[PDB]
Design an enzyme around this catalytic site. Structure first.
Site, PDB file in Angstrom:
ATOM      1  N   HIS A 123      39.856  52.598  52.367  1.00  0.00           N
ATOM      2  CA  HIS A 123      39.850  54.052  52.205  1.00  0.00           C
ATOM      3  C   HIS A 123      40.170  54.779  53.502  1.00  0.00           C
ATOM      4  CE1 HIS A 123      38.865  53.570  48.146  1.00  0.00           C
ATOM      5  NE2 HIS A 123      37.677  53.040  48.374  1.00  0.00           N
ATOM      6  N   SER A 167      33.590  42.285  45.068  1.00  0.00           N
ATOM      7  CA  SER A 167      33.193  41.570  43.860  1.00  0.00           C
ATOM      8  C   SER A 167      32.598  40.199  44.161  1.00  0.00           C
ATOM      9  CB  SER A 167      34.364  41.479  42.865  1.00  0.00           C
ATOM     10  OG  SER A 167      35.560  41.040  43.459  1.00  0.00           O
ATOM     11  N   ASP A 220      46.862  38.858  37.266  1.00  0.00           N
ATOM     12  CA  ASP A 220      47.139  40.089  37.999  1.00  0.00           C
ATOM     13  C   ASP A 220      48.649  40.211  38.169  1.00  0.00           C
ATOM     14  OD1 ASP A 220      46.981  42.307  40.146  1.00  0.00           O
ATOM     15  OD2 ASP A 220      44.862  41.871  39.834  1.00  0.00           O
ATOM     16  N   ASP A 233      51.868  41.283  33.534  1.00  0.00           N
ATOM     17  CA  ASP A 233      51.656  42.722  33.346  1.00  0.00           C
ATOM     18  C   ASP A 233      50.726  42.912  32.154  1.00  0.00           C
ATOM     19  OD1 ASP A 233      51.651  45.450  32.936  1.00  0.00           O
ATOM     20  OD2 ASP A 233      53.765  45.635  32.453  1.00  0.00           O
ATOM     21  N   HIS A 240      38.549  52.193  35.022  1.00  0.00           N
ATOM     22  CA  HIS A 240      38.391  53.416  35.761  1.00  0.00           C
ATOM     23  C   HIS A 240      39.660  53.874  36.445  1.00  0.00           C
ATOM     24  CE1 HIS A 240      37.275  51.685  39.950  1.00  0.00           C
ATOM     25  NE2 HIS A 240      38.320  51.092  39.424  1.00  0.00           N
TER      26      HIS A 240
HETATM   27  N1  LIG Z   1      49.780  45.868  34.928  1.00  0.00           N
HETATM   28  C1  LIG Z   1      49.012  46.186  35.964  1.00  0.00           C
HETATM   29  N2  LIG Z   1      49.159  47.367  36.571  1.00  0.00           N
HETATM   30  C2  LIG Z   1      48.409  47.737  37.604  1.00  0.00           C
HETATM   31  N3  LIG Z   1      47.471  47.005  38.131  1.00  0.00           N
HETATM   32  C3  LIG Z   1      47.225  45.823  37.631  1.00  0.00           C
HETATM   33  C4  LIG Z   1      47.981  45.316  36.495  1.00  0.00           C
HETATM   34  N4  LIG Z   1      47.524  44.114  36.194  1.00  0.00           N
HETATM   35  C5  LIG Z   1      46.560  43.902  37.093  1.00  0.00           C
HETATM   36  N5  LIG Z   1      46.369  44.922  37.951  1.00  0.00           N
HETATM   37  C6  LIG Z   1      45.375  44.950  39.058  1.00  0.00           C
HETATM   38  O1  LIG Z   1      44.192  45.647  38.817  1.00  0.00           O
HETATM   39  C7  LIG Z   1      43.422  45.478  39.973  1.00  0.00           C
HETATM   40  C8  LIG Z   1      42.507  46.667  40.156  1.00  0.00           C
HETATM   41  S1  LIG Z   1      41.386  46.543  41.483  1.00  0.00           S
HETATM   42  C9  LIG Z   1      40.939  44.877  41.475  1.00  0.00           C
HETATM   43  C10 LIG Z   1      39.659  44.724  40.716  1.00  0.00           C
HETATM   44  C11 LIG Z   1      39.240  43.274  40.690  1.00  0.00           C
HETATM   45  N6  LIG Z   1      38.893  42.932  39.351  1.00  0.00           N
HETATM   46  C12 LIG Z   1      38.023  43.170  41.509  1.00  0.00           C
HETATM   47  O2  LIG Z   1      37.037  43.774  41.111  1.00  0.00           O
HETATM   48  O3  LIG Z   1      38.049  42.510  42.541  1.00  0.00           O
HETATM   49  C13 LIG Z   1      44.439  45.318  41.076  1.00  0.00           C
HETATM   50  O4  LIG Z   1      44.294  44.003  41.557  1.00  0.00           O
HETATM   51  C14 LIG Z   1      45.757  45.522  40.394  1.00  0.00           C
HETATM   52  O5  LIG Z   1      46.790  44.878  41.100  1.00  0.00           O
HETATM   53  O1  LIG Z   2      36.406  52.002  46.182  1.00  0.00           O
HETATM   54  C1  LIG Z   2      37.333  51.609  45.208  1.00  0.00           C
HETATM   55  C2  LIG Z   2      36.916  50.754  44.183  1.00  0.00           C
HETATM   56  C3  LIG Z   2      37.876  50.361  43.195  1.00  0.00           C
HETATM   57  C4  LIG Z   2      39.227  50.890  43.336  1.00  0.00           C
HETATM   58  C5  LIG Z   2      40.254  50.551  42.393  1.00  0.00           C
HETATM   59  O2  LIG Z   2      39.964  49.700  41.317  1.00  0.00           O
HETATM   60  C6  LIG Z   2      41.564  51.076  42.547  1.00  0.00           C
HETATM   61  C7  LIG Z   2      42.828  50.958  41.812  1.00  0.00           C
HETATM   62  C8  LIG Z   2      43.744  51.752  42.524  1.00  0.00           C
HETATM   63  O3  LIG Z   2      43.139  52.286  43.552  1.00  0.00           O
HETATM   64  C9  LIG Z   2      41.851  51.918  43.609  1.00  0.00           C
HETATM   65  C10 LIG Z   2      40.835  52.255  44.546  1.00  0.00           C
HETATM   66  C11 LIG Z   2      39.512  51.724  44.389  1.00  0.00           C
HETATM   67  O4  LIG Z   2      38.564  52.056  45.286  1.00  0.00           O
END
Ligand SMILES: Nc1ncnc2c1ncn2[C@@H]1O[C@H](CSCC[C@H](N)C(=O)O)[C@@H](O)[C@H]1O
Ligand SMILES: O=c1ccc2c(O)c3ccoc3cc2o1
Ligand SMILES: Nc1ncnc2c1ncn2[C@@H]1O[C@H](CSCC[C@H](N)C(=O)O)[C@@H](O)[C@H]1O
Ligand SMILES: O=c1ccc2c(O)c3ccoc3cc2o1
Lengths: 348, 348
Positions: B119, B172, B219, B239, B257
């Site tokens: 961030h 995570s 992913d 995808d 979210h």
């Molecule tokens: N079709 C798609 N479009 C966008 N993001 C996608 C996707 N398929 C998977 N993702 C993924 O969604 C994730 C959101 S954040 C990662 C969260 C992960 N489950 C964790 O908690 O550690 C990213 O890794 C992003 O790359």
């Molecule tokens: O602090 C966070 C936790 C989850 C998180 C997230 O899933 C996404 C997906 C696009 O930007 C993000 C930023 C995020 O920031």
């Protein structure tokens, strides 16, 4: 398992805490806080009311505002109360608080909101990205971003100049207004020199209560040449390290926290030289407490300021009362006295 | 006069609150928190001890660290105790806290500190400067800064890709480790598809407790191709809107979210299609409370996240439990159940 959960969710909260200043910046820029101040105490607005009163055209602005309002409520800038919808669901309405007052642009020009805007401005924001380098390599974060100090930058960027001066003017209008309810110290003197007085707001508030007193607002040329005029207050462009104009007392608010000990003493010699014997130097600053781990808002404020000084200006720092007493002592002064406090600003 | 002072100093505190994330970023980058974690509980360090243990060369680093330590103590990342000097003055020593543990890079790779670093990274930080425009003009703050969404940006910037994926993996690992002390839900199934599983950290922690279970980390290609391998977990690039690989259960943590209601339902149809009948979809997310003005750290966290979603991704938002129940319902699911919570992450 309850201690671990409190600690980890605090960590997560702190890791995503850039949200607060940035959401506040947007609420100010969208006039949410002035609009709510216009509505006033106990006058609750839904997110839709607020988009309507703001004449926004974005059909999704109500939901976007709602999420901003919710941030502000969590940080106590706004209160909120529920309103029942027809189908049983609840709408949340938001309302003014005294905090909202200090973050609104009161027609009197007194506001803390410009202070938020200078720190979120893109010019100072870049200094943080050189702080880690400043610690490891020496130097000052801001000067490493720009090759010049913050005052030199202001003299070369008129937009940033106005942003900077407006944040100081907003704060010291609020602070000197409350100071003046409890400070005698200006009553019996012919003239005051505000050294580094910025846009003159502090003297504007001093002379309006004590007319007949001659105000000398002293600052750098790029600051005084872009400032309004109050009667009783004359702007002088100059350099406090070259000389300080003479007067019955010298006033310095938020000056010393920006300069090293050796530079504070250079300012104080010019102040000394500029006054007759048996005369005062009046200092307004925050003071660091001797014990550092307090979490109230007053300690957070002075601690925030000390970090701001660390990144923005070489040698700047907040100081303890004993550290201020030492500067006065080293400058040949013979009497040090902490007088009163207003909105965390002490008069010394 | 006491109410006004509390309100105004809160305003000042909030106006200078960019300090916290930026000073935290520097303490992490300077290895202050790992060093203090190395010292461990009740092992107090002066600012000089810390510069020495860090082998810093800057002769002014001790005073600079001191001022950073003081910020961290005020926000309860560190404790502190006094130590008397020879001449009567007091040195302040700083020490570990459980919060410091979650913000340290534990050799297990579990840390909240990478979340702070994504961030504060300069790529997401610029989205805030287009949020006010997004509200007035429509569109999404991030896409207005860059002309592409955040996932597209990650696929074009390998540095930001690693920064992003490491922040999710650190969070995570911590969260699923505590989840797994209280969740049955994986015990009796042959395989799990983690949809949007990022670097596989969540499945890494699931399979290490339940070997024999087949993990499918799903992913985008630029994420899985730069990730380590755990046995039991196979990475699949794809995808989630095209299709979702089939399995005994599908897992989605911090996915929904980030997507509008209509896009969540598109994900849920592909999840539906990918599972046999009488099978589960396991969702891990924060949940917004029905009442919005809470100031504890759990509410701040989910409120911070909702603002992050607002600036970073089109349509992203935190949701209430009733809003999650509705999505499952609209997706043809027949049973919705909120199971447990860990470090503010609910399993639904
Ligand atoms: N079709 C798609 N479009 C966008 N993001 C996608 C996707 N398929 C998977 N993702 C993924 O969604 C994730 C959101 S954040 C990662 C969260 C992960 N489950 C964790 O908690 O550690 C990213 O890794 C992003 O790359
Ligand atoms: O602090 C966070 C936790 C989850 C998180 C997230 O899933 C996404 C997906 C696009 O930007 C993000 C930023 C995020 O920031
Ligand atoms: N020689 C000098 N070098 C740097 N700054 C100076 C200066 N003389 C005056 N200043 C001013 O010091 C001020 C610091 S901030 C302004 C504080 C002002 N008294 C207020 O409280 O509103 C700036 O206006 C800066 O321009
Ligand atoms: O919040 C503040 C208050 C005072 C302040 C200040 O006097 C200077 C001088 C150079 O940068 C500054 C930044 C400041 O930020």
């Amino acid at each position: 398992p309850s201690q671990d959960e409190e600690a980890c969710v605090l960590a997560i909260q702190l890791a995503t805490s850039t949200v607060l200043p940035m959401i506040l910046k947007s609420a100010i820029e969208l006039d949410i806080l002035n609009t709510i101040s216009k509505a006033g105490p106990g006058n609750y607005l839904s997110p839709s009311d607020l988009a309507s009163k703001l004449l926004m055209s974005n059909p999704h602005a109500p939901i976007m505002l709602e999420r901003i309002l919710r941030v502000l409520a969590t940080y106590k800038v706004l209160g909120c109360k529920p309103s029942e919808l027809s189908d049983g669901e609840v709408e949340w309405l938001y309302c003014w608080t005294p905090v909202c007052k200090f973050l609104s642009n009161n027609e009197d020009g007194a506001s803390i909101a410009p202070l938020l805007l200078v720190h979120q401005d893109q010019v100072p924001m870049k200094s943080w990205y050189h702080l880690t380098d400043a610690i490891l390599d020496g130097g000052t974060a801001f000067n490493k971003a720009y090759g010049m100090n913050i005052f030199d930058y202001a003299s070369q960027d008129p937009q940033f100049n106005k942003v900077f001066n407006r944040s100081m003017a907003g704060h010291s209008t609020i602070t000197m207004k409350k100071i003046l309810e409890t400070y005698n110290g200006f009553e019996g003197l012919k003239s005051i020199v505000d050294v580094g007085g910025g846009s003159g707001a502090t003297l504007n508030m001093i002379i309006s209560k004590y007319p007949t007193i001659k105000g000398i607002n002293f600052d750098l040329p790029h600051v005084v040449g872009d400032s309004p005029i109050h009667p009783g207050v004359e702007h002088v462009g100059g350099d406090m390290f070259a000389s300080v104009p003479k007067g019955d007392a010298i006033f310095l608010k938020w000056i010393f926290h920006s300069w090293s000990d050796e530079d504070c003493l250079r300012i104080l010699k010019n102040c000394y030289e500029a006054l007759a014997d048996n005369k005062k130097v009046i200092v307004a600053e925050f003071i660091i407490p001797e014990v550092p781990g307090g979490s109230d808002d007053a300690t957070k404020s002075v601690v925030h300021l000390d970090a701001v000084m660390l990144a923005y200006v070489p040698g700047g720092k907040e100081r303890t009362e004993k550290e201020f007493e030492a500067l006065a002592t080293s400058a040949g002064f013979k009497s040090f006295r902490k007088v009163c406090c207003a909105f965390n600003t002490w008069i010394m």
